[PDB]
């Protein structure tokens, strides 16, 4: 009763059902290091201006 698969059928991507648990850390990776904390606030003008030597503004 065997039917030969047509052209293209063996190269299809099928879905397989299994009761094996899904691995969650397949790469055995560590914890990613924390990001540098962000700085909160709205911009205000620079205090006393550029503060460049004797320039006032």
């Amino acid at each position: 009763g065997w039917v030969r698969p047509d052209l293209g059928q063996l190269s299809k991507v099928t879905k397989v059902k299994t009761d094996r648990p899904l691995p969650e850390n397949p790469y055995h990776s560590r914890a990613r290091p924390e990001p540098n904390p962000v700085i909160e606030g709205d911009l205000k003008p620079a205090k006393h201006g550029t503060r460049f030597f004797f320039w006032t503004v």
């Binding site: 540098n36 700085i39 205090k47 006393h48 503060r51």
Partner: protein, 63 residues
């Protein structure tokens, strides 16, 4: 005008010049710490963009 104006202006100037002096010393201390520790917003040096890593299944399993 009276001495008041020159006096209290000189007080106003001295405050401005003094606050600036402390900010300038505080920026050197800040820049010394960010540069040596890389934990601040400055002196962040580039690392490869991870968005171009290929996450697709590969021709081989072990990847």
């Amino acid at each position: 005008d009276g001495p008041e104006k020159n006096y209290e202006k000189t007080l106003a100037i001295l405050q401005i010049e003094s606050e600036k002096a402390e900010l300038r010393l505080k920026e050197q201390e800040v820049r010394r710490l960010m540069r040596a520790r890389g934990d601040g917003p400055w002196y962040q040096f580039p690392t490869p963009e991870k968005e171009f890593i290929d996450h697709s299944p590969k021709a081989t399993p072990d990847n």
